[PDB]
Amino acid sequence: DLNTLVSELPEIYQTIFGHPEWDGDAARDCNQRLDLITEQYDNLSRALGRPLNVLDLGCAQGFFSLSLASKGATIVGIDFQQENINVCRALAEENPDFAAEFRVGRIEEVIAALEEGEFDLAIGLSVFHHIVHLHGIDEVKRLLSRLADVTQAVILELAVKEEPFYWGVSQPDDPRELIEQCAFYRLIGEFDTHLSPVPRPMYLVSNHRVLINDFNQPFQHWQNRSRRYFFGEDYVCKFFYYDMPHGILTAEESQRNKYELHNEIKFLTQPPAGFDAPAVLAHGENAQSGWLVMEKLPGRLLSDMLAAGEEIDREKILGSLLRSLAALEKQGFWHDDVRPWNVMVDARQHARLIDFGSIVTTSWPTNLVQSFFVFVNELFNLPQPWSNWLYAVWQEPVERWNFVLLLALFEKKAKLPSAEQQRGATEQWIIAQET
């Protein structure tokens, strides 16, 4: 009988599915977490085009398991207390069409035994802090990595050290230390536990997909540490953290990240005429982070080609870059931050800027022209006619320095007088000194 199985629960942690006579007794009503979890279930189910297999770790009285089985999910619920599992099976028996199984088992053993592809979605709500408390942080991170490795998505609600209880003392400094080794993660909500005023963050995590409410796609590789890049078949997703764990970002740096991304979004959604910019496939910002999905460009980053000493055509790289810098300038745009790590080189040795967070609209623009000289020097130090080019620019009154001029003198550099035949000289040492 259910009355008996319920009374024997050491704790009525969750709502008893379909049995509201216990809602007043449940530690946690579960409706807020459920609303968020069903939404993420729908997203991933829509993306995969089918009902999902769901794993529920530390599933307690089965509420999220049954509730998802109710929407047509196939669920396995795991808990290490026999009493919790007894209630789960009795509830599944009241719902014989739900495809729902429950097992007494330890989460550590189950994760060691999972096979990639068995489950699309795993949920682990308020369970891992127990494992943290007994096995430590490193083991939990490896468990969580493997859980992300073998599913499409993981949803975690994580207890935090700010909670007032003795076990809080064993928690990482920040719940993100448990998951930051995973590829993709995004805070999706914050929940009241009824134990204290400190809420628990809920995270959506994946080692296989970009899971953004608007764009749900596998990626095949990813790279960095408060910016992440996910590479899919024809996209790059640029993911910025504003809110970072630990001392990582200063107020200042969070705000630059935010500003740079907002700015990249604004530039790319309304590019200037005369400039070829990557198409924007999706974008969004929230308190913790912001993201931008773009069409993916071919080639390698210039910094890589220089580090991994691969062969480069500096004429073609400089000319193509300068041509775009001049086109930009004609429309009243400039790039603050022209560096080898911001430039991509395609197979035909043509270059383009890739980080548009540093695009600005307002002795301008002499400072930028100046650092471009440095850029040129790092790119190589200067042989003729490159040195002749720089020397001609140095002879210009300063109010004439701009990118149209830089480009025009670059295109005629073979006809310009020989710098080493003049005094000359100076400008050599100035640029060399910044570098």
Residues forming the site for its own copies (CB under 8 A): 112-113, 115-118, 138-139, 141-143, 145-146, 149-150, 181, 183, 207-208, 220-222
* Nearest distance, CB of residue 14 and ligand SAM, angstroms: 5
Nearer to its own copies, 112 or 408 (CB): 112
In this structure, what token pair is assigned to residue 67?
A: 């509730």
Of positions 46, 118, 173, 229, contacts ligand LY2 by CB under 6 A: 229
- Binding mask 124-153 toward Cl ion (x if CB under 5 A, else -) reads --x-xx------------------------
CA distances from residue 28 to 63, 125, 171 in whole angstroms, order as listed: 11, 12, 22
Task: Tell me whether residue 125 is exposed, middle or buried, using C-beta atoms within 10 angstroms of its C-beta: 0 to 12, 13 to 18, 19 or more.
Answer: buried
The sign one gets for the Cα dihedral 298, 302, 307, 312 is positive
Annotation-wise, does 247 bind a ligand?
no
C-alpha 283/C-alpha 311 separation (Å) is: 35
CA distances from residue 331 to 275, 293, 334, 361 in whole angstroms, order as listed: 9, 25, 9, 9
Restricting to residues 51-70, which ones interact with ligand SAM according to CB under 6 A? 58, 60
Nearer to ligand LY2, 349 or 395 (CB): 349
CA distances from residue 119 to 76, 152, 231, 260 in whole angstroms, order as listed: 9, 8, 23, 38
Annotation-wise, does 82 bind a ligand?
yes
Q: 226-232: list long-range contacts, CB under 8 Å, 24+ apart.
A: 226/253, 226/257, 227/257, 228/183, 228/184, 230/183, 230/184, 231/296, 232/296
Confirm or reject binding of residue 382 to ligand SAM (CB under 6 A).
Answer: no
- Number of residues near ligand SAM (by CB under 6 A): 16
For β-strands 53-57 and 74-79, DSSP reports them as parallel
Restricting to residues 325-354, which ones interact with ligand LY2 according to CB under 6 A? 354
Nearer to ligand SAM, 91 or 390 (CB): 91
Q: Three-state DSSP class for 423?
A: coil
C-alpha 386/C-alpha 419 separation (Å) is: 9
Amino acid making up residue 419: A
Binding site partner of 341, from its own copies, Cl ion, ligand SAM, none, Cβ cut-off 5-8 A by kind: none
Binding site partner of 58, from ligand LY2, ligand SAM, its own copies, none, Cβ cut-off 5-8 A by kind: ligand SAM
Nearer to its own copies, 168 or 245 (CB): 245
Annotation-wise, does 106 bind a ligand?
yes
Is-cis flag, bond preceding 20, omega within 30? no
Nearer to its own copies, 141 or 238 (CB): 141
Question: Do the beta carbons of residue 155 and residue 204 sit within 8 Å?
Answer: yes
C-alpha 221/C-alpha 201 separation (Å) is: 27
**Residue showing the smallest CB distance to Cl ion in the complex:** 129
Nearer to its own copies, 176 or 208 (CB): 208
C-alpha 280/C-alpha 273 separation (Å) is: 16
Q: What is the DSSP letter of 279?
A: P
Of positions 125, 188, 317, 354, contacts ligand SAM by CB under 6 A: 125
* Nearest distance, CB of residue 304 and its own copies, angstroms: 12
Annotation-wise, does 421 bind a ligand?
no
Annotation-wise, does 396 bind a ligand?
no
Confirm or reject binding of residue 178 to ligand SAM (CB under 6 A).
Answer: no
Annotation-wise, does 105 bind a ligand?
yes
Residues flagged as binding site for S-adenosyl-L-methionine: 13-14, 33, 58, 79-84, 105-108, 125
Residues near ligand LY2, by CB under 6 A: 223, 229, 231, 236, 296-297, 301, 354
Residues near ligand SAM, by CB under 6 A: 13-14, 58, 60, 78-81, 84, 106-107, 125-127, 130-131
